[PDB]
Amino acid sequence: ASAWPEEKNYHQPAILNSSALRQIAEGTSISEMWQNDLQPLLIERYPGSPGSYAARQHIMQRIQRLQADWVLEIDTFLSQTPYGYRSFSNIISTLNPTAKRHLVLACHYDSKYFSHWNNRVFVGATDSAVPCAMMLELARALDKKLLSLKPDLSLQLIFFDGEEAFLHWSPQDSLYGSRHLAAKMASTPHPPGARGTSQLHGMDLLVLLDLIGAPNPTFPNFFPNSARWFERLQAIEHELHELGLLKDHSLEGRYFQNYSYGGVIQDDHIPFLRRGVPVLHLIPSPFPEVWHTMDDNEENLDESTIDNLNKILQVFVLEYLHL
Ligand SMILES: Cc1cncn1Cc1ccccc1
Numbered sequence: 154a155s156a157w158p159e160e161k162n163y164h165q166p167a168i169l170n171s172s173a174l175r176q177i178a179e180g181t182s183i184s185e186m187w188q189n190d191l192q193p194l195l196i197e198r199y200p201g202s203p204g205s206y207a208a209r210q211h212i213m214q215r216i217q218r219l220q221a222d223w224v225l226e227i228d229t230f231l232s233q234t235p236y237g238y239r240s241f242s243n244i245i246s247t248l249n250p251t252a253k254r255h256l257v258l259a260c261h262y263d264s265k266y267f268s269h270w271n272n273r274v275f276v277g278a279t280d281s282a283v284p285c286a287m288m289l290e291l292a293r294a295l296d297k298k299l300l301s302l303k304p305d306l307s308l309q310l311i312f313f314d315g316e317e318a319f320l321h322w323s324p325q326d327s328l329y330g331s332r333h334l335a336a337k338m339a340s341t342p343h344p345p346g347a348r349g350t351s352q353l354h355g356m357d358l359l360v361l362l363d364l365i366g367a368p369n370p371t372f373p374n375f376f377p378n379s380a381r382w383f384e385r386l387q388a389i390e391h392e393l394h395e396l397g398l399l400k401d402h403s404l405e406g407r408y409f410q411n412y413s414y415g416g417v418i419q420d421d422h423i424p425f426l427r428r429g430v431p432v433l434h435l436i437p438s439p440f441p442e443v444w445h446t447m448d449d450n451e452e453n454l455d456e457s458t459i460d461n462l463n464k465i466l467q468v469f470v471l472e473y474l475h476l
């Protein structure tokens with residue numbers, strides 16, 4: 154049939170030079186991210202809540218003000234939960250929806266459901282309000298360079314709804330939005346008119362951000378087949394450090410360690426991984442100390458660590474896109 158689905162296997166980056174790295178490092182404002190992209194999301198936003206619709210409106214609005222031609226679809230669906238049927242809505246933002254291949258950035262925008270505890274409200278700053286904000290910032294910071302898109306490859310953002318369990322993590326109570334969107338893409342022909350290939354095939358690489366925002370994260374390399382792209386993240390961290398472009402950062406405590414994890418951490422990528430999508434899982438091990446506590450808030454975030462990772466990520470995306 155069609156073998157384009159193999160191009161991602163042979164795709165190679167266009168490594169940036171020191172002058173361009175500097176540019177990128179200069180091009181991203183951590184403090185504008187914090188005010189315009191991050192703070193509006195630090196609300197209770199479990200699926201079906203008022204905050205979910207708010208968070209959903211804020212993500213679409215911030216994406217809309219940008220010059221690049223983002224197409225936004227709200228993939229709304231119904232699914233059974235421990236509390237009955239409920240409605241969920243994934244946010245999908247795509248440049249050039251026609252192109253066969255797309256590099257995918259994503260995270261979950263729901264917050265785990267938890268009634269008030271000690272009069273406190275769970276807002277999951279690292280899980281995953283910050284990954285959401287890093288995605289919005291990457292799109293703003295790279296707006297002009299992405300506008301250049303009008304190799305048949307472009308960029309897609311996915312903000313999954315319903316990553317978290319409502320009552321008890323299990324295969325039927327978890328990954329609502331990603332289980333839905335992976336099965337939908339696996340059976341939607343791509344590109345338009347194709348007779349043998351799916352959108353799931355068009356996913357060049359799924360870069361899943363989760364649990365980012367704490368100090369000193371250590372990201373393992375999880376998969377033998379995306380290991381080379383993990384190595385680019387290592388390389389980019391190193392060079393930005395040597396060029397004085399990172400803050401409060403030591404090579405003794407670098408983010409992208411040279412160690413592998415022999416297993417898997419259940420997350421929104423599992424539905425795509427099982428169907429053969431390559432994944433770069435940017436989740437740290439161990440998890441933040443504030444994981445699933447009421448302390449996973451704004452005050453326990455580390456501003457420098459997010460700034461640094463924004464720069465590493467933005468470099469990675471431009472190098473993947475040859476921009
Ligand atoms: C990655 C994540 C973020 N929030 C929940 N998960 C899922 C999970 C993974 C391992 C153990 C418990 C729960």
Ligand SMILES: [Zn+2]
Nearest residue numbers: 265280317445
């Ligand atoms: Zn969680």
